[PDB]
Amino acid sequence: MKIAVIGQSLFGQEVYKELKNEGHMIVGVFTIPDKDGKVDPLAIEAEKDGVPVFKFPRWRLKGKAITEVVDQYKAVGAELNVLPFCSQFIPMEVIDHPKHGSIIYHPSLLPRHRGASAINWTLIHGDKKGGFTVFWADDGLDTGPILLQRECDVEPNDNVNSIYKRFLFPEGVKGMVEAVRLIATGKAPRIKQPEEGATYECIQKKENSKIDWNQPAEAIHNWIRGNDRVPGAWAEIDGKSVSFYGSTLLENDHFSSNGQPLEIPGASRAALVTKNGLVLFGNDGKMLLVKNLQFEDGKMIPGSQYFK
């Protein structure tokens, strides 16, 4: 069938590639404009195939959909919109335009974790189970009826990147492909989302990923891994804004074997720089270990080397 792909990043590219190699006509790709001279991977792949690439900076403006944008989209004649990882909220005149409407990839077990930072919050809350959902877009935020859903285990030391690469990405690509296949054969369902279990969380940017030190070690661990690597949980250390990556809960050891005292404003007590990384304390006195630190200037250094 004729598909419009509205998304970005490598996930958008992979969904694009699998759909076209299943024989669907990609009549248009609608991704983000290039910034810093870099073309989005989805735009790159599509232009090689002679598929029309669009790079709208915005779809809606002052409450309403932009007219020029909507008519450019409508011209490609999509029978279905596929939104692999669309970072932009889409006007209903676009969503409802195709024969089959629009389906959306979302990396949480809806109704839980509605919102664009669902993966982050899956970890921040320390969910034991995560996964993704392919749903039919409606006017609400991640509220549309479910087409399919897939579940995975959350590992105690999973960060965003690791659960994304192990499961959410590869199985998500196959889920998007299977969903389109169900639509084509005309047997895809519309499972209305249950009210019970529905949650919303804010979008995770750098400013609101600042660390609250006044929590148990486990909650700090979940927070840090839940923002690793983007946007990157951070805290003030000696006047500078320092980002934390690669957290693991740590019961061992005393002390663990000495190490160097590092004062952190707001921390329940002083941290310890050790040979294996930065040991941090929660308010319950328990410990976590952070492998990597990053200052505002982007260079990553091992926590063991803070003083060196």
38 annotated to a ligand binding site: no
Per-residue CA distances from 135 to 180, 221, 253, 287 (Å): 11, 31, 46, 40
Nearest to 212 by CA among 235, 241, 232, 229: 235
Report the site for ligand 6DD in 173-232 (rule: CB under 6 A). Answer: 203
Least separation in angstroms between CB 17 and ligand 6DD: 21
Neighbours of 262 (CB within 10 A): 18
Least separation in angstroms between CB 205 and ligand 6DD: 8
Q: Which span (31-39, 83-91, 186-194, 210-218) binds ligand 6DD, by CB under 6 A?
A: 83-91
Of 2, 17, 55, 60, the residue at the interface with ligand 6DD (CB under 6 A) is: 60
Least separation in angstroms between CB 199 and ligand 6DD: 13
Tokens of 19: 């759909």
Three-state secondary-structure class, residue 106 = strand
Report the site for ligand 6DD in 114-173 (rule: CB under 6 A). Answer: 116, 137, 141-142
Distance in angstroms (rounded) separating the CA atoms of residues 197 and 194 = 7
CA 85, distance to chain mean position in Å, is: 8
Distance in angstroms (rounded) separating the CA atoms of residues 117 and 274 = 32
Active site residue 97: no
Three-state secondary-structure class, residue 79 = coil
Q: Beta strand pairing status for 25-30 and 53-54?
A: parallel
Of residues 24, 97, 106, 113, which has the active-site annotation? 106
138 annotated to a ligand binding site: yes
Of 9, 88, 161, 294, the residue at the interface with ligand 6DD (CB under 6 A) is: 88
**Residue 95: strand pairing partners:** none
Amino acid letter, residue 244? F
Nearer to ligand 6DD, 27 or 83 (CB): 83
Of 15, 80, 104, 180, the residue at the interface with ligand 6DD (CB under 6 A) is: 104
Can you say which residues are annotated as belonging to the binding site for (6R)-10-formyltetrahydrofolate? 88-90, 142
Residues that bind ligand 6DD (CB under 6 A): 59-60, 83, 86-90, 95, 104, 106, 116, 137, 141-142, 203
Q: Which residues are catalytic?
A: 106
Annotated binding site: 88-90, 138, 142, 205
